[PDB]
Amino acid sequence: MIPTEEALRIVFGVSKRLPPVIVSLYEALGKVLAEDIRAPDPLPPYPASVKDGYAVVASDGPGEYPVITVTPGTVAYVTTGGPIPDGADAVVQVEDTKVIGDKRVKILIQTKKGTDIRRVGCDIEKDATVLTTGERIGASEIGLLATAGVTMVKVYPMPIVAILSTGDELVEPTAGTLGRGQIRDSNRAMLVAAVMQQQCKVVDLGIVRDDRKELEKVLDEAVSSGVDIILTSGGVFVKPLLEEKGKVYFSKVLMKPGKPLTFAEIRAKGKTVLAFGLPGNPVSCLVCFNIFVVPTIRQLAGWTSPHPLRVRLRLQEPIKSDPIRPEFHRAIIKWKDNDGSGTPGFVAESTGHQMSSRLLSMRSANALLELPATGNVLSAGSSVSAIIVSDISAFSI
Amino acid sequence: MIPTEEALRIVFGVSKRLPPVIVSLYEALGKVLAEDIRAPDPLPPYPASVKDGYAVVASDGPGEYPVITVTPGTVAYVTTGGPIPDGADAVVQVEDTKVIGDKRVKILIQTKKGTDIRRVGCDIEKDATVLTTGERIGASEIGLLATAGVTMVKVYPMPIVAILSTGDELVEPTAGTLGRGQIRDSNRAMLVAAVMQQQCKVVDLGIVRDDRKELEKVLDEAVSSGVDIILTSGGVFVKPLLEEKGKVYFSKVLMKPGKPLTFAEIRAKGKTVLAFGLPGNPVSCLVCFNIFVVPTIRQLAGWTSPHPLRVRLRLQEPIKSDPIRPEFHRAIIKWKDNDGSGTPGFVAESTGHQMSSRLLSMRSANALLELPATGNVLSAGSSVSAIIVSDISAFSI
Ligand SMILES: Nc1ncnc2c1ncn2[C@@H]1O[C@H](COP(=O)(O)O)[C@@H](O)[C@H]1O
Ligand SMILES: Nc1ncnc2c1ncn2[C@@H]1O[C@H](COP(=O)(O)O)[C@@H](O)[C@H]1O
Ligand SMILES: [Mg+2]
Ligand SMILES: [Mg+2]
């Protein structure tokens, strides 16, 4: 048995960033940039008016002028975002003007040079680096790529993940009345969804029975298909099959929930494939995915910060620590204007009983409280470290 | 001009949750549940062994027994997750047993009733409500649906969003050398990406010129196509066209960045379509999308908490407040073990110059600092409210 910290260090040391690809602008969304992006022209590329009004020679000052290149004694109409004609050095917004006669315009104020003008390149200078390698592409970065005219982008791809379930007792989730000794396969749909939330392509390999030849054939098809990660759950015939096909780095971790977790590296007949022999118990299966698979997906996708967000929060109820195993205690956290100590902060409620077979303990859990192995009851209002496992922007108030 | 709070209250009052639909299990991921889900059978549906070992009569105690319904004086082999035979009331893990002879088994310990057995329904009782209406579906909820055998789910759908850009000066982002008075359309790709991040289908309506008949025809095609939301940017011919087609609730908001923002409700020739006439300036366009469109998408998708996560954080540098307009100041926030006051907390750095034309001010911005209109310089180490605008689980450490 190895601590979680060593198991992560081993996974980070074995895991390698995927080779970069060129994708279309909308396929680049969510991906990490594999090249720097430079503006080929300035923004704005011409002096642009900030307002609807008249382009003037600021020195002329208040007066009546004909509307027409702008020379002293003349003005020209401009619109927001339109170019300033040559010779004009300032814009007088339409509110500070009046049309005279049944074209002549009366400028009502004394303006200053460069007023209501965006000079060439004041938002983005030509050849300036607008985005760098290692930067994740969100909506604003798509806007910067579009501004710079980059519609084909070099990025790190997401890994392709194969997923299978193991068990003679499993039936498909479409099963109605269950026969003797049968349960619905819940890990596969759960892991397919968890991987879809990580924006990875999934290869669903179905239910495999507790049969060595059958599992070997499915693992071989997975390796041969070109996937980067294989997730199995249960049966940890899995560990011995992964030892035969490649290198197993660990098979047991000091943690609650669970204990078994096999991590292996296989060489395709060639690229390497990472394999996680996840525990069968639904809770341990999803907790191991959150702690060990998520940072691996991120690392393969070129994330420079693959680790999950860790915060400090206050317990809303007392929680019993385990005397030997450090726990990943499921919780529903929220930001409060008063966290219980007077100042604002995160607070956590337990999801109830934490048995590894109890999938209801994962229901609505947006964090994993890291409880050290002291054996003591942590009182309500005491502080703990917590790993955030679901979109912090989608957090309920 | 109306404050942002009133503009939001108006949008929340006009916006209506979409009619529910039935979708497949993987299409349900990310959606809000429109029905309660009940377990049709218990979990486990049979008494299940927690270990590999022997199902025994606990009262028999240590001794040698033949392996075979279990009666006193006999034992039966069981595997993890397999059913307990009738008559056995406890499981003795294989480590506390030994096979005797060249089948007979020696039970080495005195066990207690129900040891290493998951009784019928101990994880989920039959007919128990595992998920409720209004609950968002993540990976664990997909696992609970799969456990309960629900592969067709009643949910609230995401709205379909139409998007267009306006401007005689715009060219496609594929444009290489720009002609006089031309800029690349950056708002449309940015808004398509922002809406894709909200998991909504997009109808890309392209660039529309500053021509009343042309914009009317495109708005009519958008309304006729069945979309729930229309996003336009720039030209705010937009407001007068939205007044003619439906009801405009506001056209100007007291805020920095920007000022113009038209919100309208149109009736299709019938369902209602919400229209946001977003400001043309890239920054104002994305800030208005983050503040006003995101909670609208959520409300239409049946979210009971559509508001964004608001936290309290400390400034890493001084920031000048505006004397009249409350600002949505872009920042890069991170959780620190010491926020500057001794205890752990969020900290924020400004993205630099906040001009509405400067899209670089949105680059990597994961929060909007809510700066009240005091006109004073907020010193470094002082606290402010901040709206989190990007996945808190994807926050860089
Ligand atoms: N796909 C699955 N869905 C639900 N439960 C599972 C799945 N695979 C294994 N389990 C259960 O988790 C426990 C551990 O399984 P294993 O690691 O195969 O011994 C047993 O109670 C299994 O019935
Ligand atoms: N699609 C767009 N992409 C980039 N900039 C835009 C877009 N639409 C409008 N703008 C600019 O934003 C400012 C306001 O435009 P408008 O609201 O049309 O007056 C002007 O400087 C426009 O050039
Ligand atoms: Mg099994
Ligand atoms: Mg315009």
How far is it, in rounded angstroms, from Cα B278 to Cα B260? Answer: 8
Cα torsion A359, A388, A17, A243 to 10°: value is -30
B281 CA from centroid of ligand 2 (Å): 5
Residues of A in contact with B363 (CB under 8 A): 130-131, 140-141, 144
Residues of A with Cβ-Cβ distance to B135 under 8 angstroms: 364
Which string of DSSP letters, residue by residue, matches B140-166?
Answer: HHHHHHHHTT--EEEEEPPPPEEEEEE
B116–chain A Cβ distance below 8 A for any pair = no
Distance from CA of B270 to the nearest CA of A (A): 31
* A interface test, pick of B123, B124, B339, B358 with most A CB neighbours within 10 Å: B123
Nearest-angstrom CA–CA distance, A187 and B141: 11
Separation between Cα atoms, residue B300 and residue A179, nearest integer Å: 41
Nearest to A57 by CA among A7, A93, A21, A92: A92
Q: How far apart are CA A206 and CA A191, in angstroms?
A: 12
Instruction: Please give the structure tokens belonging to residue A382.
Output: 């005491």
The Cα A268–Cα A143 span in angstroms is 39
Distance CA B275, CA B161 (A): 10
CB A201 within 8 A of CB A220: no
CB A288 within 8 A of CB A256: no
Q: CA A210 to CA A223: how far, in whole Å? A: 19
What is each CA distance from B101 to B64, B104, B106, in whole angstroms? 11, 7, 10
* Cα–Cα distance, B387 to B384 (Å, whole number): 10
CB atoms within 10 A of CB B40: 15
C-alpha distances out from residue A256 to A4, A322, A333, A353, Å? 10, 8, 20, 13
d(CA B135, CA B68): 48
> How far is C-alpha B9 from the chain's CA centre?
21
Query: A184 and B124: CB-CB below 8 Å?
Result: no
Compute CA B63 distance to the chain's CA centroid, rounded to the nearest angstrom. Answer: 57
Cβ neighbours, 10 Å, residue A231 = 28
Contact A91, A78 (CB under 8 A): yes
Per domain, the residue ranges of chain A are 1-19+158-307, 20-43+124-157, 44-123, 308-397
Tell whether B352 is within 8 A of chain A (Cβ): no
Partners of B26 in the β-ladder: none
AA identity, residue B87:
G
CB of A116 less than 8 A from some CB of B: no
The helix or strand, by DSSP H or E, that contains position B90, with its residue range, turns out to be strand B90-93
Structure token pair of residue B71 = 């009666």
Cα→Cα distances B145→A143, A180, A280, B148, Å: 38, 21, 17, 5
Ligand 1 centroid, distance to A356 Cα (angstroms): 10
Q: Tell me whether residues B138 and A390 touch, CB distance under 8 A.
A: yes
Q: In chain B, what are the helix, strand and coil shares in percent, each to the nearest 5?
A: 20, 35, 45
Query: A145 CA to middle of ligand 4, Å?
Result: 20
Instruction: Using a CB–CB cutoff of 8 Å, tell me whether B83 touches chain A.
Output: yes
| Rg of the Cα atoms in chain A | 30
Burial class (CB in 10 A: 0-12, 13-18, 19+), B69: exposed
Cα–Cα distance, A275 to A289 (Å, whole number): 12
Question: CA-to-CA distance for B78 and B58, rounded, in angstroms?
Answer: 15
Contacting residues of B for A155, CB less than 8 Å apart: none
CA atoms within 13 A on the CB side of A127: 0
B140 half-sphere exposure, CB direction, 13 A CA radius? 29
Query: A136 and chain B: CB distance < 8 Å anywhere?
Result: yes
Q: Which ligand is nearest to the CA of A170?
A: 1
E strand segments, A34-112 = 37-38, 48-49, 53-56, 63-66, 76-78, 90-93, 97-100, 104-107
| Cα(A185)–Cα(A166) distance, integer angstroms | 9
What is the three-class DSSP state of A278? strand
Sheet holding B161-166, edge to edge: B2-3, B246-254, B260-267, B272-278, B229-233, B161-166, B202-208
Contacts of A43 (CB under 8 A, 6+ apart): A121, A123, A124, A147, B183, B359
Residues 6+ apart with CB under 8 A from A219: A230, A232, A241, A242, A245, A266, A275
In this structure, what token pair is assigned to residue A53? 């009004």
DSSP strand pairing (B246-254 vs B2-3): parallel
CA distance A141 to A131: 7
Residue of B nearest to A181 (CA): B83
What values do phi and psi take at B92, rounded to 5?
Answer: -110, 115
Q: Which two tokens stand for residue B217?
A: 């025809």
| Atom number in ligand 2 closest to CA B169 | 23
Which helix (DSSP H) or strand (DSSP E) does residue A165 occupy?
strand A161-166
Residues of B in contact with A193 (CB under 8 A): 26, 29, 138-139, 142-143
* Distance between CA atoms of residues A209 and B290, nearest Å: 48
* Region of residue A361 (left: phi > 0; alpha: psi -120 to 50; beta: else): alpha
Residue type present at position B39: A
Ligand 2 first shell, C-beta below 6 A: A 48, 80-81; B 165-167, 169-170, 183, 185-188, 233-236, 279-282
In the block, residue with structure tokens 């010491």: B338
A250 touches chain B (CB under 8 A): no
Type of residue found at A197: Q
Q: Give the contacts of B68 (CB within 8 A, at least 6 positions apart).
A: B74, B75, B76
B234 contacts on A by Cβ (under 8 Å)? 81
Q: Which residues contact A213 (CB under 8 A, 6 or more apart)?
A: none
Ligand 1 pocket by Cβ (under 6 Å): A 165-167, 169-170, 183, 185-188, 233-236, 279-282; B 48, 80-81
User: Is residue A41 helix, strand or coil?
Assistant: coil
Bond from prior residue into A20 cis (ω within 30 degrees of 0): no
Report the relative pairing of strands B229-233 and B272-278 from DSSP bridges.
parallel
Looking up tokens 């009052």 gives B13
Alpha helices in A124-210 (DSSP H): 139-147, 187-197
Chain A nearest-CA residue for B50: A357
- Can you give the three-state secondary structure of A288-353, one letter per residue? HHHHHHHHHHHHHCCCCCCCCCEEEEEECCCEECCCCCCEEEEEEEEEECCCCCCCCEEEEEECCC
DSSP state of B335: E
Q: If you measure CA to CA, which chain A residue comes closest to B289? A: A139
d(CA A276, CA A263): 5
Integer Cα distance of B347 and B397 in angstroms: 11
Q: Which helix (H) or strand (E) holds B9?
A: helix B4-14
- By the 10 Å C-beta count (0-12 exposed, 13-18 middle, 19+ buried), A377 is classed as exposed
Chain B interface disruption, residue of A147, A233, A314, A362, most B CBs within 10 A: A147
> Which tokens go with B396?
């860089």
Residue type, B121: G
What is the per-residue burial (b if ≥16 Cβ within 10 Å, else e) of B5-39? eebbeebeebbeebebeeeebeebbbbbbbeebeb
Distances in Å between the Cα of A160 and the Cα atoms of A200, A223, A303, B355 are 6, 11, 16, 41
Q: Give resolution, Å, one decimal.
A: 1.7
Task: Say how many residues make up chain B.
Answer: 397
Site of tokens 């030997």: A324
Q: For chains A and B, count residue pairs whose Cβ atoms are closer than 8 Å.
A: 269
- Reference A289, options A160, A205, A195; nearest CA is A195
Q: Please answer whether residues B356 and B257 qualify as being in contact, where contact means their C-beta atoms are separated by less than 8 angstroms.
A: yes
Query: In Å, how far from its chain's centre is CA B392?
Result: 11
Task: Please say whether the beta carbons of A385 and A321 come within 8 A.
Answer: no
